[PDB]
Assembly symmetry: C2
Homo-oligomer: 133 residues x 2
């Protein structure tokens, strides 16, 4: 029973991070589509970025709710905080894209890239801790 | 022993998760780098081109190692598809980087569909491989 919880936790963690980076990739792609006048195509990218933000946030929330073991509590709260910092940056990318502002996009993009760099290394720390039961 | 094959199954799914994560991060760097370049932030865009290269090279090495270790027929067909699909993806992202260096929206769009189509297939193949690896880990325990 503990082991089936582990697989659900792993699906939540991996899907959350894949959907989160896809959310940012979509809004960047959509910004470029707007630059090229592909304005209908760009709306599909923006909608997917929004949806992927919502779905990935829900999975992080579930992961943290279910990571009660003492070895995981601190790291899971670190994940919650770093993920929130990433999601805030991607929300900033969406707002820059709606305003069609190259400079607003640059401002927040460094925050996005730095938080995702940390999410990759934090994910590996979580995978190590999950596998040690 | 069971823990050996179990340990190797976990190692394989982890290779797969890191490869897909870094592959999508590579895209995020080239697209956001193009936006930075167009805003006059040439230095940051250059760093992002380098990071896109690094990330897809690391992903490629993980994909190659995954295929080398996916010997069972339940996995090998999916694994070689993942490899062939990654090659398509990596070539399109390289096209996106060169379009960025040339400051060319037209060059960028010319390959942007190749990248998205390959990435979509990569994500489905990862899903099939994760499920098939998990099935093998459970078969051992059964």
């Amino acid at each position: 029973t503990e082991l089936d919880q582990t697989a659900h936790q792993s699906d939540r963690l991996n899907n959350a991070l894949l959907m989160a980076i896809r959310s940012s990739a979509n809004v960047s792609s959509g910004f470029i589509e707007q630059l090229g006048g592909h304005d209908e195509s760009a709306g599909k990218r923006m909608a997917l970025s929004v949806e992927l933000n919502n779905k990935s946030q829900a999975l992080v929330d579930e992961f943290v709710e279910n990571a009660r073991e003492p070895a995981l509590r601190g790291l899971a709260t670190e994940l919650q905080a770093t993920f929130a910092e990433y999601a805030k940056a991607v929300a900033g990318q969406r707002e820059a894209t709606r305003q069609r502002s190259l400079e607003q996009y640059f401002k927040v993009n460094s925050d996005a890239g730095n938080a995702m760099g940390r999410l990759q290394t934090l994910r590996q720390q979580l995978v190590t801790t999950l596998s040690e039961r």
